[PDB]
Subunit: 30 residues, 7 copies
């Protein structure tokens, strides 16, 4: 359903946030 | 649906957060 | 609808968080 | 509605998070 | 209602995130 | 209900985010 | 339910965010 799909898009965007934070982790380690 | 669309706007805003975090990682690199 | 409108407030708030993160990025450059 | 007003409480806490992030930026100068 | 109460729990958890971010700011100050 | 319970899981996850942020603050203090 | 399962996916992504932040803490150590 459309509400379920939109929520899934929210979860995907949150994963993108996790990845960007890992990029920050690596930047600090560099 | 309006609830679905609103949720999709939340997903989009979360993507902007992930981008902002990339700018932070970039500021750290250089 | 009030539920949709409240969700849009949440998206707006998340955008403000994105802009604040960019302020963090800017401060790290400087 | 109780559900809408709870969502508004969520929006308000998110604004508090944005302000805290601004405080971090300020700390960094 | 149980759904509204759960949303209130989310709001409270987010407040805790704000406080932890304030802690980070304090740490950066000195 | 399953929706209320899932929202509570989200609240719990947000609390883990707050704690991780406190870890970041601790690391910054040495 | 599909709505509940999607919200559970949101919870798991948030946990991934908590873990990424832990890695940032470790990096700062």
């Amino acid at each position: 359903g459309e509400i379920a799909q939109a929520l899934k898009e929210i979860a995907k965007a949150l994963k993108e946030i996790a990845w960007a934070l890992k990029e920050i982790a690596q930047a600090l380690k560099g």
